[PDB]
Amino acid sequence: KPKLHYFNGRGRMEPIRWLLAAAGVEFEEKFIGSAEDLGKLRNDGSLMFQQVPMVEIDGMKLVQTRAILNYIASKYNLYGKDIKERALIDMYTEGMADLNEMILLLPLCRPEEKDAKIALIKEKTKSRYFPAFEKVLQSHGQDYLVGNKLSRADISLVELLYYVEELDSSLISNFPLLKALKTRISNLPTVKKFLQPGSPRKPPADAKALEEARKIFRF
Amino acid sequence: KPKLHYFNGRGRMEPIRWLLAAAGVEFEEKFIGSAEDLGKLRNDGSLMFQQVPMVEIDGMKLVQTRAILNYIASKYNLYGKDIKERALIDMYTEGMADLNEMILLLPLCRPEEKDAKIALIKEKTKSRYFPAFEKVLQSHGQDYLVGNKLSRADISLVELLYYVEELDSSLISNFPLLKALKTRISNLPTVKKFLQPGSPRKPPADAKALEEARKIFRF
Ligand SMILES: C[C@]12CCC(=O)C=C1CC[C@@H]1[C@@H]2CC[C@]2(C)C(=O)CC[C@@H]12
Ligand SMILES: C[C@]12CCC(=O)C=C1CC[C@@H]1[C@@H]2CC[C@]2(C)C(=O)CC[C@@H]12
Ligand SMILES: N[C@H](CCC(=O)N[C@@H](CS)C(=O)NCC(=O)O)C(=O)O
Ligand SMILES: N[C@H](CCC(=O)N[C@@H](CS)C(=O)NCC(=O)O)C(=O)O
């Protein structure tokens, strides 16, 4: 079983949970609860750049979110079939990560800057990201972003669609094909199960989650 | 020939210049000098997420730095021999990208916070990043970071050592093997040519370029 080292929360680990769970892969989680827990992982040599996410998989102590996601996608056949499909999948997922980063860091914005950030997220979602992925689905008319087949790109996008819905559920309103994709993916037995109660899926960060992470990571 | 669409400066495009050059690949550049130039690329449907870097390669219009790098690396066999070597390469280059990001965004720092950021970059270089990579070279005693063969990891790291050197030339002084890798890689015929005066290699950003970039990208 791959073992995921992180705090008990979404942060940067969440896409990894999604992708493993979607690929039907059973995993264990070792929850970092304090500066001491992280401290031990640092002193053991387990963390190349002394940071997490870290995942023990196939003899490796893999750090860096993109390194872990790339490996998992390749291992479990969710990374297309060739170099051109990987280019499409990389381009798509990098775009999704850019929007993810904005949403991710929102709790760090001061009360006076928060409203401007939220408005920028909404506007970019509507004019930059959602148009781009709707255009790819519209252009080829297929059920999946790339190669008419389930990839890490579809899995990354649907997780994102759920975070956007948490923010503002009307953002997806003028994107029929994105709506249809979210539904399609959500019904896949592995995704459906991940979205059910009691799965390793993590909740949105709240006030105390930010307090707790600050005392673990020192930011 | 690939064509690289960017302003005339390092920014995010520079590692793609380094990688293409190191692979022995001649490329052209189309320099964005105004906001109207950038606007035309956007309006013509050329930028998937309305942004550069964009690279025309083998007919395709690839955006997203990491997508472009992955493609070029796969194509020219600088991405290791298998899934596990790609995992090491991904992990190593993501760590270098983190340090690179700090250096890259330094000119954006408000005057009151810039000194704190410089000392942070220096401290992390010496205790986080350089020791990590000195350790990899220690782990196998070979002349390349991964798989005993030139990869995109060697090329990304050597570019990074050159920037660290532009910041503070003493930072690498306690890292024998990194010094040696910098010399070896710099003497590879393709990289030696790229490092020659008058090549596509770009200057460090100065105040003028920051002003010029602001007019173009409106950040
Ligand atoms: C990305 C981040 C900041 C930079 C850093 O060093 C490490 C973290 C991990 C915890 C994140 C945090 C951002 C804010 C988050 C999402 C919360 O509100 C709860 C957990 C927390
Ligand atoms: C990466 C960047 C910021 C985010 C953004 O929106 C657009 C750019 C492009 C120009 C970069 C700049 C960062 C600072 C740079 C390196 C300079 O000092 C000269 C040019 C400039
Ligand atoms: N490049 C990022 C690094 C993320 C990161 O900065 N990790 C945080 C938690 S999400 C951490 O362990 N920070 C502690 C530290 O910097 O010492 C990745 O995808 O892994
Ligand atoms: N995720 C980045 C996105 C690139 C990016 O932020 N592009 C900048 C220039 S370096 C830009 O076009 N800025 C204007 C904008 O975001 O609209 C990448 O790796 O390419």
Nearest in space to A14 (alpha carbons), one of A76, A60, A65? A65
Instruction: Work out the minimum CA distance from A88 to partner chain B, whole angstroms.
Output: 8
For this PDB entry, the determination method is X-ray
Give the integer Cα–Cα distance in Å for A150 and A160: 16
Instruction: Work out the minimum CA distance from A199 to partner chain B, whole angstroms.
Output: 27
> Does the C-beta of A70 come closer than 6 Å to ligand 3?
no
Question: Helix A65-75 and helix A152-167: axis angle, to 10°?
Answer: 130
Full 3-state SS string of B142-201 = CCCCCCCCCCHHHHHHHHHHHHHHHHCCCCCCCCHHHHHHHHHHHCCHHHHHHHCCCCCC
Which of A92, A94, A135 would you mutate first to test chain B, the one with the most B CBs within 10 A? A94
Give yes or no for a contact between A16 and A68, defined as CB atoms under 8 angstroms apart: yes
Give the integer Cα–Cα distance in Å for B94 and B92: 6
Domains of chain A in start order, with CATH, are: 1-78+188-219 (3.40.30.10), 79-187 (1.20.1050.10)
Reported resolution in A?
Answer: 1.8
What residues contact residue A66 under an 8 Å CB cut-off, 6+ apart? B66, B90, B94
Residue B61, burial from CB neighbour count under 10 angstroms (0-12, 13-18, 19+):
middle
Give the integer Cα–Cα distance in Å for A146 and A156: 13
Other CB atoms within 10 A of residue B218 CB? 8
Instruction: Tell me the chain B residues in contact with residue A90 when contact means C-beta distances shorter than 8 Å.
Output: 64, 66-67, 70-71
User: Using CA positions, which residue lies closest to atom 15 of ligand 4?
Assistant: B51
What residues contact residue A207 under an 8 Å CB cut-off, 6+ apart? none
> Does the C-beta of A51 come closer than 6 Å to ligand 3?
yes
Residue B81 corresponds to which amino acid? Answer: K
- Give me the residue from B49, B83, B91 closest to A132, CB to CB: B49
Instruction: Answer positive or negative: Cα dihedral of B64, B122, A106, A21.
Output: positive
Nearest in space to A27 (alpha carbons), one of A19, A39, A38? A19
3-state secondary structure of A107: helix
Tokens 């759920």 identify what position?
A162
